[PDB]
Symmetry: D3
Subunit: 233 residues, 6 copies
């Protein structure tokens, strides 16, 4: 496809979608066997390998609705992918949400115009595939993680001048901010395939608490495991 140099059949039907291509590399090296790298266009690494015997892929998406939309469209339309699980990080916008929690997004709010253009006059609420959601929830519960299932904000702006609306969304139960889920969930629904986002809380936007990769790695490793499990089912 335009942004992926893989041949037909090189990408598995189940795929993990980190935003960072170097995290795709880490996931492939850490968890998968019999690994090939099928893409390095724009440095946006993608790999296929085996986990507990099943083929699976892992593909960086880049940051933001427009970037992930490019990759998700191509994966679905050109490579026949069926199950797509974003594995990422997010910033908590509730005191009750803690750094190192794992959030499974039921749905996402957004300040993107992508869906207002598609459905003029409507608020489109992009939804997770429930069967994948339940599988990940059950796997994370059994893995012993603090799993929260709820709403997130998919933001176009990482650096927002006023935080008033983000605070207000938090007061309406929105758990955390990230930059991709609306697009993944909307496009998967469009094409009749299955999507989920599973996120590690890496910082709290209003307390200023933050972590490096190393400082959240055990939780992050465990989260990848339950994303892979929800994939291989």
């Amino acid at each position: 496809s335009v942004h992926i140099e893989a041949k037909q059949g090189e990408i598995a039907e189940s795929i993990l979608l980190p935003g960072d291509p170097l995290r795709a590399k880490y996931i492939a090296e850490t968890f998968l066997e019999d690994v090939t790298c099928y893409n390095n266009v724009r440095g946006m690494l993608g790999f296929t390998g085996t986990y507990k015997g099943k083929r699976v892929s892992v593909q960086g998406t880049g940051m933001g609705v427009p970037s992930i939309s490019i990759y998700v469209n191509e994966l679905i339309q050109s490579y026949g992918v069926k199950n797509l699980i974003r594995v990422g990080t997010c910033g908590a916008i509730q005191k009750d949400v803690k750094v190192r929690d794992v959030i499974i997004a039921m749905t996402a709010c957004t300040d993107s115009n992508m869906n207002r253009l598609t459905f003029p006059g409507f608020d489109f609420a992009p939804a997770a595939n429930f069967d994948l959601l339940k599988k990940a929830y059950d796997a994370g519960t059994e893995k012993g993680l603090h799993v929260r299932v709820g709403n997130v904000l998919t933001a176009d702006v990482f650096y927002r001048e006023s935080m008033d609306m983000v605070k207000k969304l938090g007061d309406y139960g929105v758990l955390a901010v990230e930059m991709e889920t609306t697009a993944l969930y909307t496009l998967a629904a469009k094409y009749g395939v299955n999507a989920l986002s599973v996120l590690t809380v890496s910082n709290h936007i209003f307390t200023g608490e933050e972590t490096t990769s190393e400082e959240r790695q055990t939780t992050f490793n465990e989260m990848i495991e339950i994303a892979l499990d929800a994939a291989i089912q």
Copy 2:
């Protein structure tokens, strides 16, 4: 409160919310013991009774976002209600969704302006309480119902001149149309309480299939049972 004549403490913390007040009467008479009627203002019947030993209420809401918003605000703010389960009907907008299916709404799309006013420039995706959702899903699964968990449209207009956008929403996986869920889910989130909508598919909007109350009553009875169960937990 302005629209409910009950005294403080007459309404239980868990409540079922049919749109039709005569369905509230049917539910109270059919399922509950030790029943009182606490409201007849505007004919919008409300009852409290016991089911398998636990107090519970049932309150008509009327039709549409503005009507249910009035009742939900008053129930939460004046009567201290904690768990709110809409029990209603809907029209399928997918061929794969069948009349007599039970839909549990994860989230809702809308053509209402209610949330655009509250969050200018954003698409707010109103979400179910996951713990209530899981309890209802498990109860309906065990009850032997065809349960579908997904997205619905909360419409302001029952009679829409063009169906183009409703068809398009169906192509993006939206299961059915109804007229209340956005408001229930948004207000419950605002106030930190727990909401869910559990709906019986009564007609298919694009095939013209339809049912009377009697023609869907066994399914509807079973749905009330699993809404009550998710309530008494």
Copy 3:
């Protein structure tokens, strides 16, 4: 029709539209002769009778744009109704407007999306039928009421978190808030029939003054009389 169980011909061509079905009952019992009840679906009472010798009907609408839109569509499209007069209550948003005033709405502002969906990019100003308006004005003037003719707000939300915009509308001459007129006037215009809203001011939103039904009943009775008069002409 879907929400009205009347046979063809049971509903008169001229109809009064209170929001409260129990007010429809009161109006029929108090003012009409030879009364039949033609509907009790959803408890949304409707009656036909005679006033000073002419057939007329009275039909509850419920609260809010979506509810009244259902009834008005069915009345016009399935029952051939020609003259529709909402008879209701409202909350004043001007100090100069007094409780027990009667407001005849020339037009209505709204926070509903109903017309933005129909006319993308435009502000649709829903207008009263002038001939009905003049007849009601003349009848109320002769009846000795304080009649104010002007603009109202048709609100989707009864409980608004911030009142800033309602105050601002008051500063631009908007007289009172209610929850139905935009829909009645828009739909009547769509179908080429005649509509009017005639409202009793029951409270002042910024002074906190309020009334019970009994405390405004003489004014309310007189208002029904001039709505009926504007109907029988």
Copy 4:
């Protein structure tokens, strides 16, 4: 003021507002006695004189919401004007509306953003002063004109690429298109003064019928008379 060179007190409290400054000149010369010209800034002629003994003014506004808004703000805020009557022309968008009809605008629809900016999320329906409206209606009725009272479109674009929405507005009872009323009515309401628009239908937009000034002059003269009458009361 910035756009009017008159001294304080040179402009009467009642004023007619044609769009064309040469029509202001015609009105002053044809109907008024003891006439002064108080403005020629930008060629936007304004005059004060006497009609049946009462002082009155007549001021061109130019075409479009932004132009008339400039003049109306200055007249109200700098010159203390109290009663403002636009006297203009319009294009019919209904077959039932005829060239040479006089339309008295109850309210106006618009494709302008002026009110969406002022009232975010709301549709503001700009309304005529009813007392002035009734006075003009009664005067036109007695004068023997075909007077229509209803809704108009205030357009930003005279040359619209697609007429679909103008046709649709006609199907919802909107009588004619012009380019000023929304602004006049909104600003008068803002400042607590009295406004009305009284328009001669000069063309039918969908039949192509049209008139020159001379071809509608008797009707136009009669309309000025009843605008002046509604002014001097």
Copy 5:
């Protein structure tokens, strides 16, 4: 055309567009030879003459997007005009912008709805013809003027209740406010012809500094010269 009484061929292919028709008269009398007046409809003077031997026209537009849109549509579509240069005034909204500066608009922001209607869901950025822009820039540079090339605001409202957004636009580099450029640039682009706006700063909106025509006339004369030069090339 509807608003211009000229015969075919009476208007030159290159035209200057002041807002004030009396400025069109001043420009023709001051700079042109062999002058004819081809229009006085609505007092909106238009002239054709010769400058340094080349035919050119000058046409008042009136104030605001709707007024200039009428004239620009007719000039382009009925009179075959090819090069259109608005010559006007503006109010500075930056301290760094000085009264008597000449601004050449690259593009324009707006609070008009004109382009949102044409391109639903998009922000259309109306752009100058670069070749004309460069010619005017070079001519003004050589003439010894303080020329600033940048962004302006095309406003619908001259009298804005809150200046917050105008201040904010200034903080994003917008130089000045005027009332026509969006429309000129958009329509010229639509029809494949060449437009530019060249403006004299006449006042500073936040310091209150202001000028009369006489007080900026030398600069204004020099600006007309470089607009004419960019025209005759």
Copy 6:
């Protein structure tokens, strides 16, 4: 900063901004001397080196408004960058625009919501720094390139279901589609620094013509040269 691991002072005040980090590597290796790599976070390579003796940097941005906004905010606010030139590719949406043309964006249209959120009710037209624009134009003219200066579309969606609006924008003179310029120009203006986008046309969206990197490399090399030149001045 959060997404760039460079120390203070490692990034030059003038910077080129390709979307593809591997193009940043190519630019540094091909054109610069004394090169350091200061960033590999997320694989988003950034380099500093010397060109004709002046320090300069080159930093990948990723694809889309949200991605480039992250990098541009950090470069400006944390690293003190002053001159930012996007060097990228685009798809032509005019027949008159040819593959291998170089477009210098004066301004950009968008379907992003980023500026509607910042300036509610307004169309913000993001503008290039004119001084940088002129320097690049002059350099490209002297280099012998086909340089077009005009408007572009900054799109959120690479894969758009309907092309109707893109075609319409082309009919209004918009030259090409890309995915970053609105954000670069808006943020540079916010912070008072200088930005430009210089793009090679790599494909024609409506003819299907396309190129590989190798097939446009001579033009692309020449474009980098004139972006660097406009930088070192």
